[PDB]
Amino acid sequence: GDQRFGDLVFRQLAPNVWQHTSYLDMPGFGAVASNGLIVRDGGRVLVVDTAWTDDQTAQILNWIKQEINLPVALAVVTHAHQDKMGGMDALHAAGIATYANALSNQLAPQEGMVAAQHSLTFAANGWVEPATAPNFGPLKVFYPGPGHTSDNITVGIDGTDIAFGGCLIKDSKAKSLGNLGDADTEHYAASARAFGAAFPKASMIVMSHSAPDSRAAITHTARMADKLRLV
Numbered sequence: 001g002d003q004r005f006g007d008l009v010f011r012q013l014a015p016n017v018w019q020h021t022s023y024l025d026m027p028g029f030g031a032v033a034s035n036g037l038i039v040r041d042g043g044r045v046l047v048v049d050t051a052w053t054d055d056q057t058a059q060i061l062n063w064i065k066q067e068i069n070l071p072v073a074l075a076v077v078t079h080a081h082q083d084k085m086g087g088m089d090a091l092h093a094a095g096i097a098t099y100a101n102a103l104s105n106q107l108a109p110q111e112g113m114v115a116a117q118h119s120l121t122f123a124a125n126g127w128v129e130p131a132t133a134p135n136f137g138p139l140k141v142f143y144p145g146p147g148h149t150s151d152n153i154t155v156g157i158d159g160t161d162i163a164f165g166g167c168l169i170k171d172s173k174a175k176s177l178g179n180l181g182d183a184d185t186e187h188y189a190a191s192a193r194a195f196g197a198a199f200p201k202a203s204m205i206v207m208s209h210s211a212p213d214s215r216a217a218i219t220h221t222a223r224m225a226d227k228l229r230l231v
């Protein structure tokens, strides 16, 4: 069910949702896949996360221009690493309004990232303050607590079965939590649980570095976060 387009891969998840996948091409490591989302909200398109690079991200825009051919209203990027924010310059050159967690925008420079144009803020219960996320359509944005990073945010897609965990969640068969250099190892477990609780009906869990999975990815991630906390 995948379709290669250039160095990119696209996979339809529902009538109006597609997974985009890009691969890091650096002379020192293997072809590391990153997943993001494309959502057709009626007469416009919404993007969750860039690709690794500007060119890869423009390649995303081209696939959208070709296969959907509606204007891209906005993008939301889900934390200040390269696999999520590596392509901001491309989104800006294309006139696309960009959003990130305020904390993500604050960390951007230290991380080598260009900041998003607009900053999301969040209630104590983790739900986005609606005024900071205007006209987000079916995108339901939830900050689950520090985990994979301090800033990681998550997105549910109204009207579908899908919730996007970003790099916070790994699939049910993953061996480890991956690079934990930026990780809050104390809150990770609770933050994964908070994600699953925020989207309790979502049956397809989409993540950054595994194929879509069921809810078992959430509990599996939480357990692995608990095992690590206990050492």
Ligand SMILES: C[C@H](CS)C(=O)N1CCC[C@H]1C(=O)O
Pocket: 032, 081, 082, 083, 167, 178, 179, 209
């Ligand atoms: C550079 C990316 C940002 S999330 C990363 O840390 N990754 C990509 C896949 C897993 C993990 C790793 O390198 O160990």
Ligand SMILES: [Zn+2]
Pocket: 079, 081, 148, 149, 167
């Ligand atoms: Zn990351």
Ligand SMILES: [Zn+2]
Pocket: 081, 083, 167, 208, 209
């Ligand atoms: Zn990642």
